[PDB]
Amino acid sequence: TLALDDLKTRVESGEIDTVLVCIVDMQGRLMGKRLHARHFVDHGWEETHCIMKPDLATLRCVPWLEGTAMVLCDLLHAEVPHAPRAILKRQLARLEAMGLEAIMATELEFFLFEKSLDTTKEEHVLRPLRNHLHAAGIPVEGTKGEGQEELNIRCAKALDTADYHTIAKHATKEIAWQQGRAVTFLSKWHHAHAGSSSHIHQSLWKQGLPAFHDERDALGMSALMKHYLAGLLKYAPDYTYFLAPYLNSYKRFQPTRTVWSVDNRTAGFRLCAEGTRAVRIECRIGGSDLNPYLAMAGQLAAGIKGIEECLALPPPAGLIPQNLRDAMEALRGSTMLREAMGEDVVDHYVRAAEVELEDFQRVVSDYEVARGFE
Numbered sequence: 001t002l003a004l005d006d007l008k009t010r011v012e013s014g015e016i017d018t019v020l021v022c023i024v025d026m027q028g029r030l031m032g033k034r035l036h037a038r039h040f041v042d043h044g045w046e047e048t049h050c051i052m053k054p055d056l057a058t059l060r061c062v063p064w065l066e067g068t069a070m071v072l073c074d075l076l077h078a079e080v081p082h083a084p085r086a087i088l089k090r091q092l093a094r095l096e097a098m099g100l101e102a103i104m105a106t107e108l109e110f111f112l113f114e115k116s117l118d119t120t121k122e123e124h125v126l127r128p129l130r131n132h133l134h135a136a137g138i139p140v141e142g143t144k145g146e147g148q149e150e151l152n153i154r155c156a157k158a159l160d161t162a163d164y165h166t167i168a169k170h171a172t173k174e175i176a177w178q179q180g181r182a183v184t185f186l187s188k189w190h191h192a193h194a195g196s197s198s199h200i201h202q203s204l205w206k207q208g209l210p211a212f213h214d215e216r217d218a219l220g221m222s223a224l225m226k227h228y229l230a231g232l233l234k235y236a237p238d239y240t241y242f243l244a245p246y247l248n249s250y251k252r253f254q255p256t257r258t259v260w261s262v263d264n265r266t267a268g269f270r271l272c273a274e275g276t277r278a279v280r281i282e283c284r285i286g287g288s289d290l291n292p293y294l295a296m297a298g299q300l301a302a303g304i305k306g307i308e309e310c311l312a313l314p315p316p317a318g319l320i321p322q323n324l325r326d327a328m329e330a331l332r333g334s335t336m337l338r339e340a341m342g343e344d345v346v347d348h349y350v351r352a353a354e355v356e357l358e359d360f361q362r363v364v365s366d367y368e369v370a371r372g373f374e
């Protein structure tokens with residue numbers, strides 16, 4: 001990350017002239033304004049409207065853009081509750097009031113199309129992606145080909161991980177564009193091809209130790225981790241919507257069973273690195289269309305309250321909402337998320353799901369037409 005005073009040298013030098021002052025919307029997108037950096041260092045970092053308060057800890061250079069830097073903001077006379085960033089921070093603050101620090105990672109998938117939007121060949125997008133992100137302070141492990149690719153970023157404090165996921169989403173679209181190539185984070189862009197997921201690894205820490213670990217434990221799972229996983233499991237449909245916010249999200253489901261497992265393909269929750277310090281939980285429910293903040297904040301809610309009831313952990317080996325109408329309702333009736341996040345926030349994202357279904361009633365798809373000549 002980039003010191004404010006450091007920015008101000010880069011501005012007077014004339015190396016940086018743009019600061020993207022962003023928040024993150026429901027869709028998971030960077031939204032905001034593009035300030036002339038002189039204005040930003042003089043009164044723009046203070047506050048601007050749309051109110052956005054820049055968080056100078058989030059200030060980065062943006063190597064895949066000339067003269068350009070960015071900062072993420074808190075949206076405000078207090079913090080607006082249904083802002084995804086704010087929603088994730090709230091859960092995390094619960095966690096720290098218990099001495100617990102969440103540590104998280106995202107296996108972000110996408111599709112590289114050969115045409116513009118209008119090994120060597122892949123790397124013309126992937127290599128800059130890796131290199132520029134790394135040069136933005138984001139801890140890139142690398143790329144793995146699943147034209148379906150995947151970006152590995154080293155785990156981090158959950159709020160870091162969310163920012164990274166977001167920024168890397170952004171960088172990929174931009175770098176692909178500049179490379180004349182399309183990229184989509186669609187969970188299912190076609191029937192014939194694989195779904196793109198966003199697997200989410202999680203673990204809790206306390207003052208430095210892996211709270212999820214009992215060296216004692218049969219496979220390495222401590223008391224608290226079991227309560228945690230049991231919560232994720234109990235409330236998987238409550239927050240299915242934050243994993244699967246669009247119509248198209250449910251077509252990846254052709255990894256949806258409310259079970260945990262260390263070997264299964266059907267379990268919505270894989271157990272990784274059994275036996276070790278790096279013991280953690282993998283949620284495989286989300287596709288790559290998801291909002292990181294919300295998906296993270298949703299599970300932490302379920303994980304926290306799994307602990308606060310000392311809920312018991314069933315053996316490894318019902319179903320999550322199979323569509324968006326069901327998932328929306330499952331959120332509406334989520335008295336868990338209601339208390340965890342607030343009645344107003346839940347109602348807000350319920351309405352968000354409502355608008356998404358209604359948006360469908362107002363366009364006539366190609367599939368209707370084709371199937372409609374009988």
Ligand SMILES: Nc1ncnc2c1ncn2[C@@H]1O[C@H](COP(=O)(O)OP(=O)(O)O)[C@@H](O)[C@H]1O
Binds near residue numbers: 104106152277278279
């Ligand atoms: N304790 C942990 N908590 C959360 N995420 C972790 C932890 N340890 C590793 N990870 C993350 O899990 C992801 C999956 O990594 P893995 O499947 O072990 O292959 P590799 O680590 O060799 O890339 C990695 O991006 C890594 O950052």
